[PDB]
Ligand binder design. Structure first.
Ligand code: ZN
Ligand code: ZN
Ligand code: ZN
Lengths: 114, 266, 65, 46, 134
């Protein structure tokens, strides 16, 4: 009865953008991205890849309350590196890692006889 | 060959046992998630009941119709009614199946997954066929009837994901394990006398070398190498639960880059 | 009431496996332990699904209309 | 064929008017059930 | 799941865990006030000064009863009845405000006296939610 619609979990609302990039005031070269209609699936994965970047000084994420599929991802980088670029790269890196996994699972399945 | 590798242990129509290596745990886990949660399938979503003389409630039956597996091989050829252009549904965005059963027999009369009839035009794509896996070729037993007991209903099967209803779940349980010899000290075994004797060995204990007492604790160590087993319900073949899993997660990450680009227009 | 389509916990289809479970018990004279396993109901979540099911529909059917 | 009421015992279709005796024409049973709409009810399969 | 609360598997709830049926039966009688003067089961209408209910009367058939298939809600009139005074006055039964469902079984009989007797049952399925006890 007070239950929200199930598709509200993944479909953006009226004037909802996937990303909201707001700058962090507390620290220099730091940003806070609010991912809407997303969960741990995407959060933890991006956060983790960001940690592989030497130029990335801080990366963390949080689903502030479970009732809402959205998370905040805070990225801090070394001077002259836009945290936006840090995320851009982290993503490309993930896609390329997955593509490799697809073409290799495909490889192995096409080797199996069942 | 390139980047994170896979080594398939066993394969069937319903299960893939494999070893995912050179991956980060987060990636292995996200793929795990996606496989349950976000791979689209076709499932009955609307049930219009014409006549029902069954011992079973209209909605009890309606709910079972949802959970029945339907062919979702060419589920990409189908549109989400949500974003289709028709008033309610059409052939581009839905599969219409009719179910009509009557107790002709003096004995009990059964209603099955096989008794569903596709009335919509499939546009030549593999979709909406109820998945039959049993020996007898009957599929799921929808319900049982007496004599005058009749059941006439119409179904609208639509594209969907498990985040909306677990009926659009293309996969059953996904087996997931790493570090069988707890070399990473990621767990602290509860015991009474001996943690080793008390805690059963993994199957994957074979596929990894024990640590040996003399050797000190490796703090440098990181979790790569994940023993997994994906089990399909039948809607999509097991290989495609893994592949579509990889793709769905890819498209998801991709959407963020694209979103990041539209942002850098203004 | 009637054999649930799929396991609550993992979603493995147990909808087909009823009549076949009952024949393994009756005709094959198998025990429940081996019967469930022959049908390939591996995890206990799936086992409890069939093993513990009460098919009341059979009683309800016994009433007239 | 016109469909208003069903018998509970014999289950014979009865179709009756206001002030026409609330009994069944076969077995004189005084327990009757209303039809079911010709309207098609729809349900979300969840 | 702190202080006697628990987490439940949403996936399992969908697959049908702890989901239940719920039925409620509403009842009425054509009372015989004095001699010849009797209450009438009928779908009423705005005639002279009858104190009619706010709910939808349009779900009723001419017998002053809902058909078993129909889906009811809020204060929808499930039993239509009139009482005469000396034109008519309303005595119709509306579905419980705080409730909704689908008309299940409608029973039309006679009470021992020989007067029209009616029982309307409404079925609702109740799926486990966040405040539900176990
Ligand atoms: Zn359409
Ligand atoms: Zn299970
Ligand atoms: Zn009769």
């Amino acid at each position: 009865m007070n239950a929200p619609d199930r598709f509200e979990l993944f479909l953006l609302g009226e004037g909802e953008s996937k990303l909201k990039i707001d700058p962090d005031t507390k620290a220099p070269n730091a940003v806070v991205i609010t991912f809407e209609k997303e969960d741990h699936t995407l959060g933890n994965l991006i956060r983790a890849e960001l940690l592989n970047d030497r130029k990335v000084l801080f990366a963390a994420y949080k689903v502030e309350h479970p009732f809402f599929a959205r998370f905040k991802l805070r990225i801090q980088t070394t001077e002259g590196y836009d945290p936006k670029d840090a995320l851009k790269n982290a993503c490309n890196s993930i896609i390329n890692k997955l593509g490799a996994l697809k073409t290799n699972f495909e490889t192995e399945w096409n080797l199996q006889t069942l | 060959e390139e980047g994170p590798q896979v080594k398939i242990r066993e394969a069937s129509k319903d299960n893939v046992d494999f070893i995912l290596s050179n991956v980060d745990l987060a990636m292995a886990n996200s793929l795990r998630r996606v496989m349950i949660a976000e791979i689209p399938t076709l499932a009955i979503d609307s049930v219009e009941v014409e006549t029902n003389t069954t011992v079973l409630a209209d909605e009890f039956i309606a709910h079972r119709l949802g959970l029945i597996p339907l062919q979702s091989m060419d589920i990409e050829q189908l549109e989400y009614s949500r974003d289709c252009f028709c008033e309610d549904h059409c052939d581009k965005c839905s599969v219409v199946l009719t179910l009509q059963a009557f107790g002709e027999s003096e004995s009990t009369t059964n209603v099955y997954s096989k008794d569903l009839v596709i009335v919509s035009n499939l546009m030549g794509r593999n979709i909406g066929h109820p998945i039959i896996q049993d020996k007898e070729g009957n599929g799921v037993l929808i319900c049982k009837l007496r004599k005058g007991q009749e059941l006439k209903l119409t179904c609208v099967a639509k594209k969907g994901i498990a985040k909306e209803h677990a009926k659009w779940g293309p996969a059953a349980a996904i087996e997931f394990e790493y570090d069988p010899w707890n070399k990473l000290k990621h767990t602290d075994y509860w015991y009474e006398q001996d943690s080793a004797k008390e805690w059963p060995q993994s199957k994957n204990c074979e596929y990894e070398d024990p640590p040996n007492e003399g050797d000190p604790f490796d703090y440098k160590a990181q979790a790569d190498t994940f023993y997994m087993n994906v089990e399909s319900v039948g809607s999509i073949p097991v290989d495609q639960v893994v592949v579509r899993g990889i793709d769905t997660l890819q498209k998801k990450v991709a959407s963020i880059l694209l979103a990041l680009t539209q942002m850098d227009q203004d | 009431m009637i054999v649930p389509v799929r396991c609550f916990s993992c979603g493995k289809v147990v909808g087909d496996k009823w009549e076949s479970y009952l024949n393994l018990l009756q005709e094959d004279e198998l025990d429940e332990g081996t019967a469930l396993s022959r049908l390939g109901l591996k995890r206990y979540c799936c086992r409890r699904m069939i093993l513990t099911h009460v098919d009341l529909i059979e009683k309800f059917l016994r009433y007239n209309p | 064929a016109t469909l208003k009421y069903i018998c509970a015992e014999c289950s014979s279709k009865l179709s009756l008017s206001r002030t026409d005796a609330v009994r069944c024409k076969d077995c004189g049973h005084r327990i009757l059930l209303k039809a079911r709409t010709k309207r098609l009810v729809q349900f979300e399969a969840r | 799941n702190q202080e006697d609360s628990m987490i439940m598997n949403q996936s399992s709830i969908d697959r049908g865990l702890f989901r239940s049926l719920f039925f409620r039966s509403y009842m009425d009688q054509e009372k015989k006030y004095g001699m010849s003067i009797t209450e009438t089961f009928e779908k009423p209408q705005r005639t002279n000064t009858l104190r009619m209910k706010h709910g939808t009367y349009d779900k009723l058939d001419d017998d002053g009863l809902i058909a078993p298939g129909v889906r009811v809600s809020g204060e929808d009139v499930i039993i239509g009845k009139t009482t005469p005074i000396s034109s008519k006055r309303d005595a119709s039964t509306p579905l419980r405000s705080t409730e909704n469902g689908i008309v299940d079984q409608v029973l039309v009989t006679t009470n021992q006296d020989g007067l029209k007797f009616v029982k309307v049952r409404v079925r609702t399925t109740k799926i486990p939610q966040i405040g539900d006890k176990f």
